[PDB]
């Protein structure tokens, strides 16, 4: 797809097999979801740093599908105001900014 | 240009005629710079909301130039950890996300 930016760029994403909405966010290093259940082993990760740090769960090599493109990526699980697709997942889908 | 996202997408931007580095951030509604001096009238704007609100100065129809493209847009001036080019400016330069 070709996504213009007059509106916030939300997309439907299937993550480890469940349907969620998430923001395509070039200002975010990492992809993060709240309220999903991923199997297997995770590592705790400290993220953020403003006002303190946030603890989340890092899951590696998770299957993720966006606009019919199935890829594999690092997913963080933890609280977040909205779900975020960060640059980590954008490189896997082959997303560029163009102008 | 065509910017891949393996690295954080910083670009040089000329804002109201002054050279700054800023992040191309599709997760930000608004463009914001710290420590520039813009002429003319501004209005106060409340932004953010998490942990409180931030007060900034909103300048309208400011000339902005990125990769040789001169455009006009709304610029906020206020504290920000890095300078941000938000969707407001990206729509003016004709920036799309593609994959």
From TrEMBL, chains A, B:
Alphabetic keyword roster: Aspartyl protease, Host endosome, Hydrolase, Protease
Q: What is its main location?
A: host cell
Task: Tell me where on the tree of life, at the top rank, the source sits.
Answer: Viruses
Pfam families noted in UniProt: RVP (PF00077)
Please list the residue ranges annotated as the Peptidase A2 domain: 20-89
Task: Please verify whether the record's keywords include Thylakoid.
Answer: no
The record's annotation in InterPro entries points to: Aspartic_peptidase_AS, Peptidase_A2_cat, Peptidase_aspartic_dom_sf, Retropepsin-like_cat_dom, Retropepsins
Q: Could you mention a single GO BP entry for this protein?
A: proteolysis
For this record, the Gene Ontology CC terms, alphabetical, are: host multivesicular body; virion membrane
The name this protein carries in UniProt is Protease
**Species of provenance:** Human immunodeficiency virus type 1 (HIV-1)
């Amino acid at each position: 797809p070709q996504i213009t930016l007059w509106k916030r760029p939300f997309v439907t994403v299937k993550v480890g097999g469940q349907l969620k909405e998430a923001l395509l966010n070039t200002g975010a290093d990492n992809t993060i979801f709240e309220d999903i259940n991923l199997p297997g082993r995770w590592k705790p990760k400290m993220v953020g740093g403003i006002g303190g740090f946030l603890k989340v769960r890092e899951y590696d090599q998770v299957p993720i599908e966006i606009a019919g493109h199935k890829v594999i990526g690092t997913v963080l699980v933890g609280p977040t105001p909205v779900n975020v697709i960060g640059r980590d997942t954008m490189t896997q889908i082959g997303a560029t900014l163009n102008f």
